Protein backbone atom coordinates (compact mmCIF):
# COMPACT_ATOMS: atom_id res chain seq x y z
CA UNK A 1 0.00 0.00 0.00
CA UNK A 2 1.31 3.44 -0.88
CA UNK A 3 1.68 5.60 2.24
CA UNK A 4 0.30 9.05 2.77
CA UNK A 5 2.84 11.60 1.65
CA UNK A 6 3.41 15.35 1.56
CA UNK A 7 1.49 17.11 -1.24
CA UNK A 8 4.56 17.78 -3.40
CA UNK A 9 6.68 14.75 -2.56
CA UNK A 10 7.00 11.75 -4.79
CA UNK A 11 6.85 7.99 -4.17
CA UNK A 12 8.25 4.93 -5.89
CA UNK A 13 9.08 1.39 -4.87
CA UNK A 14 10.55 -1.81 -6.25
CA UNK A 15 12.06 -5.20 -5.42
CA UNK A 16 9.40 -7.80 -5.16
CA UNK A 17 10.03 -11.27 -6.71
CA UNK A 18 12.38 -12.72 -4.10
CA UNK A 19 10.06 -15.42 -2.68
CA UNK A 20 9.11 -13.32 0.35
CA UNK A 21 7.03 -10.20 0.88
CA UNK A 22 9.71 -7.60 1.59
CA UNK A 23 10.48 -4.70 -0.71
CA UNK A 24 12.24 -1.36 -0.98
CA UNK A 25 10.33 1.90 -1.20
CA UNK A 26 11.50 5.48 -1.51
CA UNK A 27 10.24 9.06 -1.23
CA UNK A 28 11.62 11.95 -3.22
CA UNK A 29 10.40 15.27 -1.91
CA UNK A 30 11.47 17.88 -4.52
CA UNK A 31 11.72 20.71 -2.00
CA UNK A 32 12.89 23.91 -3.75
CA UNK A 33 16.59 23.09 -3.81
CA UNK A 34 17.09 24.95 -7.08
CA UNK A 35 19.79 22.51 -8.19
CA UNK A 36 18.08 20.37 -10.80
CA UNK A 37 19.10 16.73 -10.81
CA UNK A 38 19.09 14.72 -14.04
CA UNK A 39 21.05 12.52 -16.39
CA UNK A 40 22.73 13.67 -19.59
CA UNK A 41 24.21 17.12 -19.00
CA UNK A 42 23.60 19.29 -22.08
CA UNK A 43 26.25 19.30 -24.77
CA UNK A 44 26.22 22.57 -26.73
CA UNK A 45 23.90 24.67 -28.86
CA UNK A 46 25.09 24.60 -32.44
CA UNK A 47 26.04 28.17 -33.22
CA UNK A 48 24.61 30.06 -36.15
CA UNK A 49 21.12 28.55 -36.00
Amino acid sequence: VTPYLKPYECFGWSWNDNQDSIYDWWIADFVSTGAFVCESNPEAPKTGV
Binding site: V31, S32, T33, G34, A35
Partner: protein, 49 residues
Amino acid sequence: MFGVTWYNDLVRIVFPPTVLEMQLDGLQWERVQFNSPVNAGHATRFNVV
Protein backbone atom coordinates in the same frame (compact mmCIF):
# COMPACT_ATOMS: atom_id res chain seq x y z
CA MET B 1 34.45 37.98 1.81
CA PHE B 2 31.78 35.29 2.05
CA GLY B 3 28.93 34.31 4.29
CA VAL B 4 25.74 32.34 4.76
CA THR B 5 22.09 33.27 5.23
CA TRP B 6 19.08 31.42 6.53
CA TYR B 7 16.33 34.05 6.47
CA ASN B 8 12.95 32.22 6.35
CA ASP B 9 14.84 28.95 5.64
CA LEU B 10 16.25 30.25 2.34
CA VAL B 11 19.63 28.81 3.23
CA ARG B 12 22.25 30.40 0.97
CA ILE B 13 25.92 29.52 1.29
CA VAL B 14 27.62 32.22 -0.75
CA PHE B 15 31.18 32.53 -2.04
CA PRO B 16 32.41 35.07 -4.64
CA PRO B 17 32.47 32.46 -7.44
CA THR B 18 29.26 30.57 -6.61
CA VAL B 19 26.23 30.39 -4.33
CA LEU B 20 24.47 27.31 -2.99
CA GLU B 21 20.74 27.69 -2.38
CA MET B 22 18.55 25.36 -0.32
CA GLN B 23 15.15 25.44 1.32
CA LEU B 24 14.40 22.93 4.05
CA ASP B 25 10.94 22.42 5.51
CA GLY B 26 11.80 21.32 9.06
CA LEU B 27 14.64 23.85 9.43
CA GLN B 28 15.11 26.97 11.56
CA TRP B 29 18.42 28.42 12.73
CA GLU B 30 18.79 31.00 15.45
CA ARG B 31 22.15 30.38 17.16
CA VAL B 32 25.66 31.22 15.93
CA GLN B 33 28.83 29.86 17.52
CA PHE B 34 31.65 31.62 15.72
CA ASN B 35 35.21 30.56 16.46
CA SER B 36 38.50 32.05 15.33
CA PRO B 37 41.99 30.80 14.48
CA VAL B 38 44.67 31.22 17.12
CA ASN B 39 46.47 34.24 15.61
CA ALA B 40 45.78 36.62 12.75
CA GLY B 41 48.14 39.29 11.45
CA HIS B 42 45.56 42.05 11.43
CA ALA B 43 42.23 41.68 13.28
CA THR B 44 40.15 38.76 12.09
CA ARG B 45 36.49 39.68 11.83
CA PHE B 46 32.99 38.21 11.99
CA ASN B 47 29.44 39.51 11.83
CA VAL B 48 26.09 38.01 12.76
CA VAL B 49 23.28 39.82 10.93
